[PDB]
From a paper:
Methylation catalysed by catechol-O-methyltransferase (COMT) is the main pathway of catechol neurotransmitter deactivation in the prefrontal cortex. COMT is a single-domain Mg2+-dependent methyltransferase that catalyses the transfer of an activated methyl group from S-adenosylmethionine (SAM) to its catechol substrate. The crystal structure of COMT comprises a central β-sheet flanked by α-helices, constructing a bipartite active site that accommodates the methyl donor SAM (in the so-called adenine site) and that can also complex an Mg2+ ion to which the catechol substrates bind. Here, a set of apo, semi-holo, holo and Michaelis form crystal structures are described that define the conformational space available to COMT and that include likely intermediates along the catalytic pathway.
A potential problem for in vivo data gained from mouse models that are not transgenic for human COMT is differences in the structures or activities of the homologues. In order to assure that the binding mode of compounds to mouse COMT is the same as that for rat and human COMT, it was hoped to determine a number of mouse COMT crystal structures in complex with selected inhibitors. However, in our hands mouse COMT proved to be difficult to crystallize and only an apo structure was obtained. However, when comparing this apo form with a human COMT apo structure, three loop regions that adopt different conformations in human and mouse COMT are identified. In human COMT the α2/α3 loop is disordered, but it is well defined in mouse COMT. Loop regions β5/α9 and β6/β7 are well defined but differ by distances of up to 8 Å at their tips. Importantly, in the mouse COMT structure these three loop regions adopt the same conformations as in the rat COMT structures and (see below). While it is possible that the apo state of COMT can adopt several conformations owing to an absence of conformational restrictions on the active-site loops, the recurrence of the same state in rat and mouse COMT points to a stable state of this apo form that is independent of crystal form and organism and that therefore may be adopted by COMT during catalysis after the reaction products have dissociated.
Author numbering: 46 to 258
């Protein structure tokens, strides 16, 4: 099968049903063994948890999904009354992500919207009754981080204190996205570099907190 199908199969064969921690560990172990992604829990999961704990969002928007690791990671921390919206253009990735959340017992915490963010973001207010977002997680399509961010602003979906957290921001990648959020007085920025036990960056994340237009 595809890599995402194989990740799901592994979780289904090895993880404890209804146990988000077990699901995350199964994905992490498998991806590390395959050398597809090293210790994602230490490299990005702990940082995601810290951001969610710091800001305590009621409404999180995830832009992009692959196998559902990130959706499980975030959704497991959301209390009653809080929820995750996940947008992903690839229906195969959306499908795996749905099955992964189902396995973790987290389906009622998340709505998956299948389509291009360009098309869906402008529908959030009128179609999905959103006013503003508390947090945005930018997950996988780094060439879309800047245009997604500008569209969120254009649509009036960011408010003062909304936190954007972008994964896989490792120099010299995403130079335009970083120059934009750092250069703009509308964002307060923090960069995280995860080295695990060695000398080279394994994953990098940018936190950008909206300060208003
Ligand atoms: O795999 P993910 O976490 O969905 O990106
Ligand atoms: O590169 P870094 O982020 O400085 O460590
Ligand atoms: Na800035």
């Amino acid at each position: 099968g595809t890599k995402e199908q194989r990740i799901l199969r592994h979780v289904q064969q090895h993880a404890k049903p209804g146990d988000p921690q077990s699901v995350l560990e199964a994905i992490d172990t498998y991806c590390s063994e395959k050398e597809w992604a090293m210790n994602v829990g230490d490299a990005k999961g702990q940082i995601m948890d810290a951001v969610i704990r710091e800001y305590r969002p009621s409404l999180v928007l995830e832009l992009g999904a692959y196998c559902g690791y990130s959706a499980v990671r975030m959704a497991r921390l959301l209390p009653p009354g809080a929820r995750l919206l996940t947008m992903e253009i690839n229906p195969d990735y959306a499908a795996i992500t749905q099955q992964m959340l189902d396995f973790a017992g987290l389906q009622d915490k998340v709505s998956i919207l299948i389509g291009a963010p360009q098309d869906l973001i402008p529908q959030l207010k009128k179609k999905y009754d959103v006013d503003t977002l508390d947090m945005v997680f930018l997950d996988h399509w780094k060439d879309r981080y800047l245009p997604d961010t500008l569209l969120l602003e254009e649509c009036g979906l960011l408010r003062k204190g909304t936190v954007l957290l972008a994964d896989n921001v490792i120099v010299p990648g995403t130079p335009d996205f970083l120059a934009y959020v750092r250069g703009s007085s509308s964002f307060e920025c923090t960069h995280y570099s995860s080295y695990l036990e060695y000398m080279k960056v394994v994953d990098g994340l940018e936190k950008a907190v909206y300060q208003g237009p």
